[PDB]
Amino acid sequence: IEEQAKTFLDKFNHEAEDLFYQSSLASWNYNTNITEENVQNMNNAGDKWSAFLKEQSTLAQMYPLQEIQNLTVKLQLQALQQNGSSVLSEDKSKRLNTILNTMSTIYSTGKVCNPDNPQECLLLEPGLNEIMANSLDYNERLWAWESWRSEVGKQLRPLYEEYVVLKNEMARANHYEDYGDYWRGDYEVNGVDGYDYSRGQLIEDVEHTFEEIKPLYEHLHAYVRAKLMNAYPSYISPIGCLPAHLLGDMWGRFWTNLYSLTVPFGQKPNIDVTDAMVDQAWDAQRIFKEAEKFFVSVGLPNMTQGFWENSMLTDPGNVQKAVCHPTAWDLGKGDFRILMCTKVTMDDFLTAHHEMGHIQYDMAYAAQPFLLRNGANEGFHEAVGEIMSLSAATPKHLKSIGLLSPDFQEDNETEINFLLKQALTIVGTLPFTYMLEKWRWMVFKGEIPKDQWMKKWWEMKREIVGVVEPVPHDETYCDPASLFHVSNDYSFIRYYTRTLYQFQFQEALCQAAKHEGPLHKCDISNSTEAGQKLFNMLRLGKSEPWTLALENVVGAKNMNVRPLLNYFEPLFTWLKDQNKNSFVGWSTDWSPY
Amino acid sequence: NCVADYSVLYNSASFSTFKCYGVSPTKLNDLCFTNVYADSFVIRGDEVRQIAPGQTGKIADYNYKLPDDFTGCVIAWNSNNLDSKVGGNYNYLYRLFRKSNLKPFERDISTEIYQAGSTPCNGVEGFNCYFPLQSYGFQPTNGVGYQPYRVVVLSFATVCGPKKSTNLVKNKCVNFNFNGLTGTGVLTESN
Ligand SMILES: *[C@@H]1O[C@H](CO)[C@@H](O[C@@H]2O[C@H](CO)[C@@H](O)[C@H](O)[C@H]2NC(C)=O)[C@H](O)[C@H]1NC(C)=O
Ligand SMILES: *[C@@H]1O[C@H](CO)[C@@H](O[C@@H]2O[C@H](CO)[C@@H](O)[C@H](O)[C@H]2NC(C)=O)[C@H](O)[C@H]1NC(C)=O
Ligand SMILES: *[C@@H]1O[C@H](CO)[C@@H](O[C@@H]2O[C@H](CO)[C@@H](O)[C@H](O)[C@H]2NC(C)=O)[C@H](O)[C@H]1NC(C)=O
Ligand SMILES: *[C@@H]1O[C@H](CO)[C@@H](O[C@@H]2O[C@H](CO)[C@@H](O)[C@H](O)[C@H]2NC(C)=O)[C@H](O)[C@H]1NC(C)=O
């Protein structure tokens, strides 16, 4: 009966917010001051946290969930009563843990060797991805690309073949038909009257939005192909798919690094304010107060004070061992702080808005239960940071904050040079971001069988992405497993969903502010009702579904891609003017070999 | 049976709140009663919002009650430097659960397993039944709403106020008062 569940979860929430604090504070202290004592401390703190959470979960499993009436305690029971693991036999559980560490160590430690001199080798990020991001030697890119797959990706093939089984046994034993249906289960909504959403419903809705994107990507693919034939002559057809080793990294995940090969009008200076920051001699303290000013300006509260003392914004005059990777930390107990070590660059001036936009959401739902202090889905939680970074990047913001001269003129060719750099980044990844999850969902259920895993992958690269294998492949490879999100066991679909919600949030607040022009020019500095419409989604946590929270921001009870398309109509109008002479889209028959 | 300069507390800016609910504070130099009682303890800042007449929630229902008709005030101040600790401070306790919401000024300093629904239980306190006493965990780096605050409650004949006096002018026509008496005249030194 519900009072038993309520007062169980009251005891749980009162205990959990302390145990999570002393755990996450030791984790903070380790990441900002690395020592073996701090490691052994934060590990034995994480042990005591995990031991509490599981020792409570076996009690959470005894409450009958159908005897619960109020949504917000049902959501908290279901979040604590979940089994996840321990469903497996104890030896299969240890085997799955062993496989995850094995795929993780192979990806992170994997060496690629040089055939001209085998005494020299490369790890993944230093040197080997540096070739793929900055080399123009087709044969060196092709060597790095195929040697990664053959020397490390082939090690992961026979592990991924066992990971899929043990994850599917875990998913089934949780009563989900496959592990992809377990992952989709984040977006699931039930019993809220019409606002409901099925695990399967994401599968058709993602394809129903992706088939609106294709014309923008087909003109971008035709434009980028017509450019890349000047960078890689005789290797590329004017009608073919693009050879995968030419795509700006090891996987072709983003075309953002192709910009110097693909730029519209590079004689117009693509705008920077790093010069204005050093001419005004700005430091981290100034950068972050000029970041805070935007939030108190739009209509949000200023930081929880102890933020400034307990955050690390820069590197310590001591030769400290720490992770400088810019990270927003919530520790519980209302303790908000960023870990980073900033340098005077406009990328960090925008990253100060990006990370503070995480904290401002974590503060608004601090009134919610510990189990519910999270984004309404895994796309909300990053998109709500980026809509701050969007506004801070605008030329109207940048002159108003004093980072551009009052006499400076922006022009169309500056718009197109910016928008194509955005398109190679934001739009060009979406075929891959849909395709990798389609392939994995069809692998977990066995719609792609273990004798056609790689055969179906390269058919989908050619059909969905317009990208072709530089050399033929077979079922000894796993080119999916050559990537972090496949080897380290992470669901990728959040990035598709965040890339719709970002523009749905932005255009709604820009209409609420009555912005007068293109969506990429929109600024919410010195608004107020934009902050009011933002806040009413911000203070719900998980306690209400994303299908309800979206209609308070956007005015829609579901995801819509229109706002992203709108953001690119000025560029698409120009891409349709550049390629009138060209073929558009691709042949899936053509290959570089 | 003593004088009580509430004017010092009212003027001193150290308090995060000084709030009155049965009285307006400047009149306390004149207003008097048989006793005044001070209650004193340590609390989380956002939850100090539950310490007033007629309110509800975790403190107001399950620590002690001020009535809606509370003849008195409530003061509170930052205690971070003393009552929070680096490894956390856990010396402070609260009983989270109790059947029947408490009466005015009532004290339930007893504890047994609270329990919910139709079920029998004898200690153990995992499923359906829980031990309702818990500790706080005050840590200096908390958000300002979870930091510790010292709190004092005053419930408001013998406790009068500081009935201050004028200078005294001799050999002049004056409108005098002495103790509980009045009069007018020339005040000359006598023998
Ligand atoms: C169960 O749901 C009800 C409403 O559906 C919640 O009731 C609110 O509770 C707060 C105090 O916690 C009151 O301030 C509101 O006035 C209540 N609203 C209404 C309309 O009654 C209740 O909180 C939920 N249960 C739990 C444990 O949160
Ligand atoms: C969680 O896994 C257990 C098996 O370990 C599932 O079966 C439960 O078994 C326990 C005894 O160990 C019983 O107390 C439960 O009644 C069983 N399940 C229930 C509640 O019907 C259990 O079904 C799994 N729970 C979930 C989340 O489905
Ligand atoms: C940027 O704006 C200028 C100004 O309109 C454009 O120049 C015009 O281009 C059209 C199409 O070729 C000509 O018919 C006009 O005569 C041009 N006007 C001038 C004043 O030269 C230019 O094409 C625009 N560039 C982009 C990339 O949109
Ligand atoms: C938006 O807010 C900023 C910051 O409050 C405004 O900047 C001020 O502008 C006035 C008029 O030029 C100056 O006198 C002030 O000195 C500026 N403040 C600072 C801190 O430099 C800005 O004008 C506002 N813009 C709009 C359109 O509302």
GROMACS .gro file of C-alpha atoms in nm, chain A residues 24-199:
model
  176
   24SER     CA    1   3.093   1.232  -0.552
   25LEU     CA    2   3.304   1.474  -0.337
   26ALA     CA    3   3.584   1.212  -0.315
   27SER     CA    4   3.542   1.167  -0.695
   28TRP     CA    5   3.572   1.550  -0.732
   29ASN     CA    6   3.882   1.563  -0.503
   30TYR     CA    7   4.049   1.283  -0.705
   31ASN     CA    8   3.978   1.447  -1.049
   32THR     CA    9   4.115   1.791  -0.928
   33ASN     CA   10   4.409   1.653  -0.714
   34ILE     CA   11   4.524   1.311  -0.844
   35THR     CA   12   4.700   1.089  -0.585
   36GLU     CA   13   4.687   0.713  -0.511
   37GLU     CA   14   4.538   0.792  -0.164
   38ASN     CA   15   4.265   1.001  -0.338
   39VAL     CA   16   4.205   0.707  -0.583
   40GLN     CA   17   4.183   0.443  -0.305
   41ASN     CA   18   3.955   0.686  -0.109
   42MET     CA   19   3.713   0.767  -0.399
   43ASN     CA   20   3.697   0.396  -0.497
   44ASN     CA   21   3.610   0.278  -0.139
   45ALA     CA   22   3.353   0.566  -0.122
   46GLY     CA   23   3.198   0.450  -0.457
   47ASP     CA   24   3.190   0.093  -0.313
   48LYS     CA   25   2.984   0.213  -0.008
   49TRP     CA   26   2.748   0.414  -0.235
   50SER     CA   27   2.688   0.118  -0.473
   51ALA     CA   28   2.645  -0.125  -0.178
   52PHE     CA   29   2.374   0.106  -0.030
   53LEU     CA   30   2.191   0.145  -0.366
   54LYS     CA   31   2.176  -0.234  -0.433
   55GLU     CA   32   2.096  -0.323  -0.065
   56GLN     CA   33   1.797  -0.081  -0.089
   57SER     CA   34   1.698  -0.208  -0.442
   58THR     CA   35   1.616  -0.564  -0.312
   59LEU     CA   36   1.360  -0.395  -0.078
   60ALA     CA   37   1.235  -0.173  -0.368
   61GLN     CA   38   1.166  -0.500  -0.555
   62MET     CA   39   0.909  -0.614  -0.292
   63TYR     CA   40   0.661  -0.320  -0.336
   64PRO     CA   41   0.380  -0.407  -0.590
   65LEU     CA   42   0.407  -0.129  -0.855
   66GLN     CA   43   0.040  -0.172  -0.969
   67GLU     CA   44  -0.076  -0.072  -0.612
   68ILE     CA   45   0.072   0.283  -0.660
   69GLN     CA   46  -0.158   0.572  -0.768
   70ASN     CA   47   0.054   0.894  -0.773
   71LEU     CA   48   0.290   0.928  -1.077
   72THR     CA   49   0.588   1.079  -0.888
   73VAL     CA   50   0.624   0.794  -0.632
   74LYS     CA   51   0.556   0.526  -0.902
   75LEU     CA   52   0.843   0.678  -1.108
   76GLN     CA   53   1.070   0.666  -0.797
   77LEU     CA   54   0.978   0.304  -0.709
   78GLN     CA   55   1.032   0.192  -1.071
   79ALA     CA   56   1.373   0.374  -1.080
   80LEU     CA   57   1.486   0.194  -0.753
   81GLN     CA   58   1.311  -0.142  -0.817
   82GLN     CA   59   1.492  -0.201  -1.147
   83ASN     CA   60   1.706  -0.516  -1.163
   84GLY     CA   61   1.934  -0.453  -1.460
   85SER     CA   62   2.204  -0.705  -1.363
   86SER     CA   63   2.192  -0.991  -1.110
   87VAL     CA   64   1.926  -1.135  -1.346
   88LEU     CA   65   2.208  -1.328  -1.516
   89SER     CA   66   2.377  -1.638  -1.368
   90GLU     CA   67   2.673  -1.525  -1.149
   91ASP     CA   68   2.936  -1.669  -1.391
   92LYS     CA   69   2.765  -1.503  -1.697
   93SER     CA   70   2.751  -1.177  -1.495
   94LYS     CA   71   3.131  -1.195  -1.427
   95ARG     CA   72   3.185  -1.293  -1.796
   96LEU     CA   73   2.991  -0.983  -1.916
   97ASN     CA   74   3.195  -0.762  -1.675
   98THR     CA   75   3.513  -0.928  -1.816
   99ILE     CA   76   3.400  -0.866  -2.181
  100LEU     CA   77   3.320  -0.496  -2.112
  101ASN     CA   78   3.669  -0.443  -1.957
  102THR     CA   79   3.818  -0.642  -2.251
  103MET     CA   80   3.649  -0.430  -2.525
  104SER     CA   81   3.732  -0.112  -2.324
  105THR     CA   82   4.105  -0.202  -2.281
  106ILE     CA   83   4.141  -0.312  -2.649
  107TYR     CA   84   3.989   0.019  -2.778
  108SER     CA   85   4.185   0.243  -2.533
  109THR     CA   86   4.528   0.062  -2.554
  110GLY     CA   87   4.517  -0.056  -2.922
  111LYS     CA   88   4.839  -0.001  -3.130
  112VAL     CA   89   4.862   0.047  -3.512
  113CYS     CA   90   5.200  -0.033  -3.668
  114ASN     CA   91   5.390   0.117  -3.962
  115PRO     CA   92   5.471  -0.144  -4.240
  116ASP     CA   93   5.785   0.054  -4.352
  117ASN     CA   94   5.932   0.050  -3.994
  118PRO     CA   95   5.758  -0.182  -3.736
  119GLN     CA   96   5.958  -0.033  -3.441
  120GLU     CA   97   5.722   0.273  -3.469
  121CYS     CA   98   5.351   0.240  -3.371
  122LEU     CA   99   5.055   0.474  -3.289
  123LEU     CA  100   4.778   0.475  -3.026
  124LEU     CA  101   4.430   0.593  -3.144
  125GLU     CA  102   4.409   0.967  -3.048
  126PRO     CA  103   4.780   1.083  -3.067
  127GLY     CA  104   4.922   1.058  -3.425
  128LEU     CA  105   4.667   0.810  -3.574
  129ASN     CA  106   4.356   1.037  -3.550
  130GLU     CA  107   4.592   1.336  -3.615
  131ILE     CA  108   4.654   1.189  -3.967
  132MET     CA  109   4.275   1.162  -4.023
  133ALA     CA  110   4.203   1.521  -3.898
  134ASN     CA  111   4.499   1.708  -4.067
  135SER     CA  112   4.680   1.488  -4.334
  136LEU     CA  113   4.590   1.512  -4.708
  137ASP     CA  114   4.802   1.206  -4.811
  138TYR     CA  115   4.528   0.963  -4.938
  139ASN     CA  116   4.758   0.658  -4.889
  140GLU     CA  117   4.848   0.753  -4.526
  141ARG     CA  118   4.483   0.820  -4.440
  142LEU     CA  119   4.389   0.486  -4.602
  143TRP     CA  120   4.672   0.312  -4.408
  144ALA     CA  121   4.558   0.461  -4.071
  145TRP     CA  122   4.188   0.387  -4.151
  146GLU     CA  123   4.228   0.019  -4.261
  147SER     CA  124   4.511  -0.063  -4.011
  148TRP     CA  125   4.286   0.053  -3.720
  149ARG     CA  126   4.011  -0.182  -3.841
  150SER     CA  127   4.239  -0.479  -3.920
  151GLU     CA  128   4.477  -0.449  -3.614
  152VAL     CA  129   4.216  -0.347  -3.344
  153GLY     CA  130   3.860  -0.364  -3.495
  154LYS     CA  131   3.913  -0.737  -3.582
  155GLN     CA  132   4.003  -0.804  -3.213
  156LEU     CA  133   3.662  -0.661  -3.112
  157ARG     CA  134   3.458  -0.864  -3.364
  158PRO     CA  135   3.469  -1.196  -3.167
  159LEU     CA  136   3.402  -1.003  -2.837
  160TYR     CA  137   3.102  -0.809  -2.978
  161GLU     CA  138   2.959  -1.150  -3.088
  162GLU     CA  139   2.946  -1.250  -2.712
  163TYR     CA  140   2.854  -0.905  -2.565
  164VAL     CA  141   2.530  -0.903  -2.778
  165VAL     CA  142   2.427  -1.243  -2.627
  166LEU     CA  143   2.491  -1.153  -2.260
  167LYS     CA  144   2.326  -0.807  -2.299
  168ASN     CA  145   2.023  -0.972  -2.467
  169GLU     CA  146   1.999  -1.232  -2.182
  170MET     CA  147   2.013  -0.938  -1.934
  171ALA     CA  148   1.744  -0.748  -2.135
  172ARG     CA  149   1.516  -1.053  -2.167
  173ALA     CA  150   1.559  -1.143  -1.798
  174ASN     CA  151   1.443  -0.779  -1.735
  175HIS     CA  152   1.140  -0.867  -1.965
  176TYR     CA  153   1.258  -0.655  -2.268
  177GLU     CA  154   1.274  -0.854  -2.598
  178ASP     CA  155   1.624  -0.715  -2.692
  179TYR     CA  156   1.887  -0.481  -2.534
  180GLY     CA  157   1.801  -0.202  -2.786
  181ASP     CA  158   1.439  -0.206  -2.649
  182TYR     CA  159   1.594  -0.173  -2.299
  183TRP     CA  160   1.791   0.140  -2.420
  184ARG     CA  161   1.486   0.291  -2.596
  185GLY     CA  162   1.304   0.246  -2.261
  186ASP     CA  163   1.450   0.584  -2.138
  187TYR     CA  164   1.200   0.771  -2.364
  188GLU     CA  165   0.901   0.549  -2.258
  189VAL     CA  166   0.591   0.730  -2.117
  190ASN     CA  167   0.272   0.558  -1.979
  191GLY     CA  168  -0.050   0.630  -1.782
  192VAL     CA  169  -0.039   1.016  -1.820
  193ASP     CA  170  -0.348   1.043  -2.052
  194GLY     CA  171  -0.257   1.094  -2.425
  195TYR     CA  172   0.102   1.211  -2.339
  196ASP     CA  173   0.206   0.835  -2.348
  197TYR     CA  174   0.497   0.712  -2.571
  198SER     CA  175   0.592   0.349  -2.667
  199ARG     CA  176   0.947   0.207  -2.675
   0.00000   0.00000   0.00000
